[PDB]
Design a protein around this ligand. Structure first.
Ligand code: HEM
Length: 154
Protein backbone atom coordinates (compact mmCIF):
# COMPACT_ATOMS: atom_id res chain seq x y z
CA UNK A 1 0.00 0.00 0.00
CA UNK A 2 1.13 3.66 0.34
CA UNK A 3 1.46 5.61 3.59
CA UNK A 4 0.62 9.29 3.80
CA UNK A 5 3.21 11.77 5.01
CA UNK A 6 1.16 12.16 8.19
CA UNK A 7 1.37 8.41 8.79
CA UNK A 8 5.12 8.46 8.20
CA UNK A 9 5.45 11.28 10.74
CA UNK A 10 3.67 9.17 13.36
CA UNK A 11 6.09 6.32 12.61
CA UNK A 12 9.14 8.55 12.82
CA UNK A 13 7.99 10.33 16.00
CA UNK A 14 7.86 7.07 17.96
CA UNK A 15 11.09 5.90 16.33
CA UNK A 16 12.77 9.04 17.68
CA UNK A 17 11.97 7.73 21.17
CA UNK A 18 13.36 4.26 20.36
CA UNK A 19 16.56 6.05 19.39
CA UNK A 20 17.04 7.44 22.89
CA UNK A 21 18.19 3.89 23.72
CA UNK A 22 18.04 1.51 20.78
CA UNK A 23 19.90 -1.19 22.71
CA UNK A 24 17.31 -1.39 25.50
CA UNK A 25 14.42 -1.36 23.05
CA UNK A 26 16.08 -4.14 21.05
CA UNK A 27 16.48 -6.28 24.16
CA UNK A 28 12.81 -5.86 25.03
CA UNK A 29 11.69 -6.61 21.47
CA UNK A 30 13.81 -9.74 21.00
CA UNK A 31 12.90 -11.06 24.45
CA UNK A 32 9.22 -10.52 23.67
CA UNK A 33 9.64 -12.31 20.34
CA UNK A 34 11.40 -15.29 21.94
CA UNK A 35 8.87 -15.53 24.81
CA UNK A 36 5.83 -15.31 22.51
CA UNK A 37 7.25 -17.53 19.73
CA UNK A 38 10.08 -19.66 21.16
CA UNK A 39 10.69 -21.39 17.82
CA UNK A 40 12.18 -18.12 16.53
CA UNK A 41 15.10 -18.35 18.97
CA UNK A 42 16.28 -21.49 17.15
CA UNK A 43 17.29 -19.35 14.16
CA UNK A 44 20.01 -17.53 16.16
CA UNK A 45 22.87 -20.00 16.33
CA UNK A 46 24.90 -17.53 18.40
CA UNK A 47 22.52 -17.48 21.38
CA UNK A 48 19.82 -20.14 20.80
CA UNK A 49 21.00 -21.91 23.97
CA UNK A 50 19.72 -19.14 26.27
CA UNK A 51 17.14 -20.60 28.65
CA UNK A 52 15.64 -17.69 30.62
CA UNK A 53 14.79 -14.02 30.31
CA UNK A 54 17.56 -13.29 32.81
CA UNK A 55 20.11 -14.94 30.51
CA UNK A 56 18.67 -13.04 27.55
CA UNK A 57 18.98 -9.70 29.36
CA UNK A 58 22.60 -10.47 30.26
CA UNK A 59 23.61 -11.52 26.74
CA UNK A 60 25.85 -9.01 24.99
CA UNK A 61 25.36 -10.91 21.71
CA UNK A 62 21.57 -10.60 21.95
CA UNK A 63 21.88 -6.89 22.75
CA UNK A 64 24.16 -6.27 19.77
CA UNK A 65 21.78 -8.22 17.54
CA UNK A 66 18.85 -6.09 18.63
CA UNK A 67 20.81 -2.92 17.85
CA UNK A 68 21.74 -4.22 14.41
CA UNK A 69 18.19 -5.20 13.48
CA UNK A 70 16.48 -2.09 14.85
CA UNK A 71 19.02 0.22 13.22
CA UNK A 72 18.46 -1.47 9.84
CA UNK A 73 14.70 -1.19 10.31
CA UNK A 74 15.04 2.46 11.29
CA UNK A 75 16.97 3.19 8.11
CA UNK A 76 14.18 1.51 6.12
CA UNK A 77 11.46 3.49 7.93
CA UNK A 78 13.31 6.76 7.33
CA UNK A 79 13.13 6.08 3.58
CA UNK A 80 9.32 6.35 3.87
CA UNK A 81 8.72 3.54 1.40
CA UNK A 82 11.65 4.32 -0.92
CA UNK A 83 13.57 1.37 0.50
CA UNK A 84 14.43 -0.77 -2.53
CA UNK A 85 18.19 -0.53 -2.02
CA UNK A 86 17.96 -1.36 1.69
CA UNK A 87 15.72 -4.39 1.16
CA UNK A 88 18.01 -6.13 -1.35
CA UNK A 89 20.79 -7.31 1.00
CA UNK A 90 18.36 -7.87 3.85
CA UNK A 91 15.99 -10.01 1.80
CA UNK A 92 18.88 -12.03 0.39
CA UNK A 93 20.44 -12.78 3.76
CA UNK A 94 17.13 -13.52 5.48
CA UNK A 95 15.87 -15.74 2.65
CA UNK A 96 19.06 -17.64 1.85
CA UNK A 97 21.45 -17.52 4.80
CA UNK A 98 19.16 -17.25 7.85
CA UNK A 99 15.95 -18.77 6.33
CA UNK A 100 13.42 -16.52 8.05
CA UNK A 101 9.81 -17.18 6.95
CA UNK A 102 7.39 -14.29 6.47
CA UNK A 103 5.49 -15.64 9.48
CA UNK A 104 8.54 -14.88 11.64
CA UNK A 105 8.71 -11.33 10.27
CA UNK A 106 5.05 -11.07 11.33
CA UNK A 107 6.05 -12.28 14.80
CA UNK A 108 8.81 -9.67 15.17
CA UNK A 109 6.43 -6.97 13.92
CA UNK A 110 3.99 -7.98 16.67
CA UNK A 111 6.82 -7.77 19.24
CA UNK A 112 7.78 -4.28 18.02
CA UNK A 113 4.18 -3.11 18.33
CA UNK A 114 3.84 -4.68 21.80
CA UNK A 115 6.98 -3.02 23.16
CA UNK A 116 6.20 0.40 21.65
CA UNK A 117 2.67 0.20 23.06
CA UNK A 118 4.09 -0.53 26.53
CA UNK A 119 6.99 1.95 26.56
CA UNK A 120 5.57 4.84 24.51
CA UNK A 121 1.92 5.63 25.28
CA UNK A 122 2.75 9.31 24.61
CA UNK A 123 3.68 8.54 20.98
CA UNK A 124 1.91 5.23 20.39
CA UNK A 125 -1.81 5.82 20.70
CA UNK A 126 -4.23 4.19 18.29
CA UNK A 127 -3.49 6.32 15.22
CA UNK A 128 0.27 5.99 15.72
CA UNK A 129 0.00 2.23 16.16
CA UNK A 130 -2.05 2.02 12.97
CA UNK A 131 0.62 3.96 11.09
CA UNK A 132 3.38 1.70 12.42
CA UNK A 133 1.36 -1.38 11.49
CA UNK A 134 0.96 0.01 7.97
CA UNK A 135 4.71 0.67 7.70
CA UNK A 136 5.58 -2.83 8.92
CA UNK A 137 2.97 -4.38 6.60
CA UNK A 138 4.59 -2.50 3.67
CA UNK A 139 8.03 -3.73 4.74
CA UNK A 140 6.79 -7.32 4.92
CA UNK A 141 4.94 -7.07 1.60
CA UNK A 142 8.02 -5.80 -0.18
CA UNK A 143 10.35 -8.33 1.49
CA UNK A 144 7.95 -11.15 0.58
CA UNK A 145 8.05 -10.05 -3.05
CA UNK A 146 11.85 -10.05 -2.96
CA UNK A 147 11.90 -13.48 -1.29
CA UNK A 148 9.94 -14.85 -4.23
CA UNK A 149 12.31 -13.22 -6.73
CA UNK A 150 15.20 -14.82 -4.81
CA UNK A 151 13.68 -18.32 -4.95
CA UNK A 152 12.43 -18.58 -1.34
CA UNK A 153 8.76 -19.26 -0.70
CA UNK A 154 9.03 -17.69 2.77
C1 HEM B 1 12.45 -6.09 11.29
C2 HEM B 1 12.90 -7.26 10.86
C3 HEM B 1 14.38 -7.58 10.77
C4 HEM B 1 15.42 -6.79 10.45
C5 HEM B 1 15.41 -5.31 10.03
C6 HEM B 1 16.63 -7.58 10.55
C7 HEM B 1 17.90 -7.11 10.32
C8 HEM B 1 19.04 -7.87 10.40
C9 HEM B 1 20.36 -7.40 10.09
C10 HEM B 1 20.69 -5.97 9.65
C11 HEM B 1 21.21 -8.42 10.25
C12 HEM B 1 22.73 -8.43 9.99
C13 HEM B 1 23.02 -8.42 8.48
C14 HEM B 1 22.34 -9.54 7.74
O1 HEM B 1 22.68 -10.72 7.97
O2 HEM B 1 21.43 -9.27 6.90
C15 HEM B 1 20.44 -9.56 10.67
C16 HEM B 1 20.94 -10.81 10.96
C17 HEM B 1 20.20 -11.90 11.36
N1 HEM B 1 18.82 -11.94 11.43
FE1 HEM B 1 17.54 -10.41 11.13
N2 HEM B 1 16.28 -8.86 10.92
C18 HEM B 1 14.91 -8.89 11.06
C19 HEM B 1 14.16 -9.99 11.44
C20 HEM B 1 14.66 -11.22 11.77
C21 HEM B 1 13.91 -12.31 12.35
C22 HEM B 1 12.40 -12.26 12.65
C23 HEM B 1 14.77 -13.32 12.55
C24 HEM B 1 14.52 -14.71 13.17
C25 HEM B 1 13.36 -15.16 13.67
C26 HEM B 1 16.07 -12.90 12.11
C27 HEM B 1 17.22 -13.66 12.11
C28 HEM B 1 18.48 -13.20 11.87
C29 HEM B 1 19.70 -13.96 12.06
C30 HEM B 1 19.72 -15.41 12.55
C31 HEM B 1 20.74 -13.18 11.76
C32 HEM B 1 22.24 -13.49 11.88
C33 HEM B 1 22.55 -13.18 13.36
C34 HEM B 1 23.95 -13.49 13.80
O3 HEM B 1 24.87 -13.47 12.95
O4 HEM B 1 24.12 -13.73 15.03
N3 HEM B 1 15.98 -11.60 11.63
N4 HEM B 1 19.12 -9.20 10.75
Amino acid sequence: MVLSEGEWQLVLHVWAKVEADVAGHGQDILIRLFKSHPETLEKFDRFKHLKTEAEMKASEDLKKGGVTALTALGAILKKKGHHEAELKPLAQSHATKHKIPIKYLEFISEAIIHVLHSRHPGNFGADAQGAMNKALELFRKDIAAKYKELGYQG
